[PDB]
Every structure is written in C-alpha cells, then in structure tokens.
Design a binder for this molecule. Structure first.
Ligand SMILES: *S(=O)(=O)c1cccc(C(=O)OC[C@H]2O[C@@H](n3cnc4c(N)ncnc43)[C@H](O)[C@@H]2O)c1
Length: 289
C-alpha cells in the first residue's frame, strides 16, 4: 500500500470519472469532476484531469507514477505549469489529479488556428512564448530540468493559459530510443541539444535549445521541424552546424532569439530569466493589429 498524505488526499467518492483523454503506455488520463476540492467550497465541482495506471501495469510503472507525483509536490504551484491538485492513494488504485487544460497541446492549438474558427495576432504568438518561458523560468528556479520541452508538452487552458506538462516524468535516460516516434509521427531527437543527444548531458542550457525549437514551432503555427529527415541525417546536420531557416512572419529579433537558443556553446545561450525579460519587452512592442 502507499503512505497516506493528508496535504493532497481527496476521498474517492468526491471524484466523478468521465471520458478518457487518451493513454500513455504506463497510464491513461481521464477527464473528471472533483467535488469540493477547495475546503471553502464543498458544493462546487471542478473539472480536472486524472492520471491512473493502466491494467497490466508493473511495480516499476507504479513507482514511476509515484515519483512524478512526489516531484510535483516538491515543485510547488505556478500559473504556467500543470499543477497537482490532489490524489486518491488509499483503498484502491492510484489516481493523481491535475489541472485540466481544455484546449489540448499547443501544437494542436496552433495548427487549428492557421489561416484557411479563431486566428492569432503577432502579439498572441509572442505572448504564448512569454508564458512558456515563464513556466520554464519557474521550473529552473526549483532545479527541475524538463528534458523534453516541445509544443506537444505544453497545454492550453480554456482561458488560453499555456501550461508546461510532463516536467516530472521519470526518464531513465540513455534507454531513450532515438528511432521511436510521437503518435503524430514526429521524432523527439529533433528538439534535443547536441550535447544531450551525443553525450547524454542534460542541463538548463539544453532545455533552452529545446525552447528555441519551440519558438520556431510557435512562429510556424505548429510546423514540424526537419520534415522528412531521419535520425542519421539529423545527426549529420547537427555535426555540420546546420540551423533551421527563419519562418515567414517572424521578426529578425525573434529569429535572432532562436538562433541564440541554438548557440553551439551551452554557456553562451541565454537563460530562461533573460528570455523572459526580452519576451516581456517584445510583447509590449508587438502589434495586435
Ligand atoms: S503516463 O504514461 O506517465 C502519461 C503521461 C503524459 C500523458 C499521458 C496520456 O495518457 O495522455 C493522453 C492525452 O491526454 C492529454 N492530457 C494529459 N494531461 C492533460 C491535462 N492535464 N489536461 C488536458 N489534457 C491532458 C495529453 O495531451 C494526451 O493527448 C500519460
């Protein structure tokens, strides 16, 4: 059995399980309604996402889900990350309950708003980047390295708030399969800094490289990096120092940002604290017209 933790325990009967949002292989995420999540409002329901372990799941799968939950407890709350809201741990299968993001991942959100029901100004796109940088600056401030920052791991709420997700996932790095694709058919190696990819060294500076690729995804409205490039050719591109071309409808100043994220020398990349401040000024100067 699992240890009881009254900071986070929600009685099982206060959770009304709904439809599946999809499955990992370790688990399954469902939409749910939580009744009386706040102590002050016991008669209010809150929509929430609920993680739980699929059927034929092992001890390793369990401990991995537990590690993720414990990490989110230590990291604390921020507007631009997916926050932990409670857990059902006792007398039945483990549920971890987190903030629900109604508008899906940022990649989907962006592709759905491409020119042909809703469109995005240049201010909105820069604001999107500012929010992800903020979440990242917070995460970094609590000593967390994401290791897979990408538009697909950013979620968007009903109020269009960007939230970093999957920042507490268990990795067991160097067991990563470079050939295996996302369900969308893309390859996660295309977001990884060369030091993380060749030498398996992960740092905040490598997450900054990943954030550059994310900026490029945002300004191409959800484009796919290096389309048609398989793993071995990607390796050759990185060795040669190739850098992705500037998206149309991206200012020079934002492209220079991406390129600074993609500095071959990790120490010379900007920090998330620096990116936050620059994006803050750029948002303010960018037209919504
Ligand atoms: S598990 O195996 O560790 C794990 C980890 C991440 C995601 C999943 C999963 O099954 O995702 C399915 C589907 O649901 C979306 N999702 C995940 N969390 C949320 C929240 N908080 N709000 C809205 N949607 C969410 C994922 O993007 C994915 O599309 C399993």
């Amino acid at each position: 059995e699992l240890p009881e933790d009254p900071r986070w325990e929600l009685p099982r009967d206060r959770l009304v399980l709904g439809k599946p949002l999809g499955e990992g292989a370790f688990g399954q995420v469902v939409l749910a309604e939580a009744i009386g999540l706040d102590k002050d409002k016991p008669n209010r329901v809150t929509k929430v996402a609920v993680k739980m372990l699929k059927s034929d799941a092992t001890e390793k799968d369990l401990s991995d889900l537990i590690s993720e939950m414990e990490m989110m407890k230590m990291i604390g709350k921020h507007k631009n990350i997916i926050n932990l809201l409670g857990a059902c741990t006792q007398d039945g299968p483990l549920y971890v309950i987190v903030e629900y993001a109604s508008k899906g991942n940022l990649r989907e959100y962006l592709q759905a708003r491409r020119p042909p029901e809703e469109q995005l100004s240049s201010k909105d796109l820069v604001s999107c980047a500012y929010q992800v940088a903020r979440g990242m600056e917070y995460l970094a401030s609590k000593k967390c390295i994401h290791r897979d920052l990408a538009a697909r791991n950013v979620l968007v709420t009903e109020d269009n708030v960007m939230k970093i997700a999957d920042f507490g996932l268990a990795r067991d790095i160097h067991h990563i399969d470079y050939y295996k694709k996302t369900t969308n058919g893309r390859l996660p190696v295309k977001w990884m800094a060369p030091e993380a990819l060749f030498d398996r060294i992960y740092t905040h500076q490598s997450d900054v490289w990943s954030f550059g690729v994310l900026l490029w995804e945002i300004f191409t409205l959800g484009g796919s990096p290096y389309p048609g490039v398989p793993v071995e050719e990607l390796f050759k591109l990185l060795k040669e120092g190739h850098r992705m071309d500037k998206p149309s409808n991206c200012t020079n100043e934002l492209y220079m940002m991406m390129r600074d994220c993609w500095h071959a020398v990790p120490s010379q990349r900007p920090t998330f604290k620096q990116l936050v401040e620059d994006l803050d000024r750029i948002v303010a100067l960018t037209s919504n017209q």
